[PDB]
């Protein structure tokens, strides 16, 4: 499930990047050397996603039907396939980071791959 947690964190980072049009949080996450830097990005990306939810510019959907997240940014429409992390996924991911900050780099690499594929399409 460690890979499922990392994949859900990567989906959150990709949604935040596509909505904000900024790589800065993904760069900070992939370069993190401490639990402080990782936790700060996990808050800031969720705060960006919260604004998109309140504006109805970020919504959960289905697209067999797969769970997805629709993102509207600057008149562009993006769809990220997968679930967003739960509170338990964030807590278990922070425990994985307290053991090895490598998992932040792995999630950042996956998030950038998701965002790049969607931007290319």
């Amino acid at each position: 499930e460690k890979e499922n947690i990392i994949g859900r964190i990567a989906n959150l980072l990709a949604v935040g990047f596509l909505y904000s049009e900024s790589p800065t949080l993904v760069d900070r996450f992939a370069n993190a050397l401490s639990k402080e830097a990782v936790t700060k990005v996990l808050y800031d990306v969720q705060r960006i996603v919260q604004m998109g939810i309140d504006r109805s510019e970020i919504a959960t959907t289905t697209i067999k039907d797969y769970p997805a997240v629709n993102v509207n940014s600057s008149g562009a429409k993006y769809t990220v396939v997968g679930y967003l992390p739960t509170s338990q996924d964030i807590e278990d991911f922070l425990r994985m980071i307290e053991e090895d900050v490598y998992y932040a780099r792995k999630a950042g690499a996956l998030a950038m791959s998701i965002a790049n594929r969607i931007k290319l399409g």
């Binding site: 050397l33 307290e98 090895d100």
Partner: protein
């Protein structure tokens, strides 16, 4: 010998910027395992290597030597401590390369006379007749104090921008803080002394004449290091250092005080000094201590005030 252990408190600096990726300059870090009741945790901690300290010490030594009058090499007058490693340096200086093993001592004496830094610093010449001379001063990595169950060392990133009137500009710098500690050794009993076996060769009389000045300069050069004049990026990131604890031991035999990690290392090193003197039939053994954090000391110690008095007493 003169050995020492000192404990520093640096607040905001980037003194060793290993590597650079993207628009970011990275500090240097080392792994440390911290034991906890639950288990063990791997942490990454800033470290300053000893090569930068060696470079700073040798630069200070050159600046002092050129002011007293002892010989200083040509390439070393410029702050480029290549030292007589390859044929090009010898050709520039004008020293005949050693012929064979027997001539090794003659070439060593010649080089030792032509350049002070090759004497205290040491050198290695590659070729069919290799020559060696180990440095007379030794330093070790700077690591923060792994005391208790906390590591008082933080390392953040900072964002900077170059302004322009025609935008078409961004960089990041890693800035650290910690309670640093380091230990040094300096054997003044081998300064100005050839380091090979063989019959004596002409010129050693000059070395004996200049021994006193060379040793005095070598001891004076440590004031810079103990004063905090090392590292890089000192132009736009001037640090704020301060001195907390220092133990300096002078003896007649191998000795090295305890690392300044535990909160009580002065007492332990004093006891070990007593034992070492007892077991090695030592004659001279003195220790000086500077205490500003109010830690346990013991008895049988000289209490100074600053590094200036320490250097004066070392000279006397």
């Amino acid at each position: 010998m003169i050995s020492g252990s000192v404990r520093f408190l640096v607040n905001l600096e980037s003194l060793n910027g290993v590597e650079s990726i993207g628009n970011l300059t990275k500090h240097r870090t080392a792994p440390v395992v911290l034991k906890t009741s639950t288990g063990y945790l791997v942490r990454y901690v800033p470290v300053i290597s000893g090569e930068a300290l060696a470079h700073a010490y040798q630069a200070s030594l050159v600046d002092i030597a050129k002011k007293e009058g002892l010989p200083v090499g040509s390439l070393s007058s410029q702050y480029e401590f290549i030292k007589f490693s390859t044929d090009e340096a010898l050709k520039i200086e004008g020293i005949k390369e050693p012929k064979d093993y027997n001539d090794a001592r003659r070439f060593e004496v010649e080089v030792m006379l032509k350049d002070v830094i090759a004497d205290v610093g040491g050198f290695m010449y590659a070729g069919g007749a290799p020559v060696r001379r180990t440095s007379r001063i030794k330093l070790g990595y700077m690591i923060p104090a792994l005391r208790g169950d906390e590591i008082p060392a933080q390392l953040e990133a900072q964002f900077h921008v170059r302004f322009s009137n025609k935008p078409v500009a961004i960089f990041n710098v890693e800035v650290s803080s910690a309670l640093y500690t380091f230990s040094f050794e300096l054997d003044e009993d081998l300064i100005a002394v050839p380091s090979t076996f063989g019959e004596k060769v002409k010129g050693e009389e000059e070395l004996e004449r200049q021994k006193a000045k060379r040793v005095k300069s070598a001891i004076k050069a440590l004031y810079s290091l103990l004063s905090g004049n090392f590292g890089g990026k000192r132009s736009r990131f001037l640090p704020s250092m301060k001195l907390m604890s220092l133990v300096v031991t002078k003896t007649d035999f191998p000795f090295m005080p305890e690392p300044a990690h535990d909160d009580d290392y002065i007492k332990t090193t004093i006891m070990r000094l007593g034992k070492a003197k007892g077991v090695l039939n030592g004659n001279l053994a003195k220790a000086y201590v500077i205490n500003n954090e109010g830690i346990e000391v013991g008895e049988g110690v000289t209490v100074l005030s600053t590094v200036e008095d320490l250097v004066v007493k070392l000279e006397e």
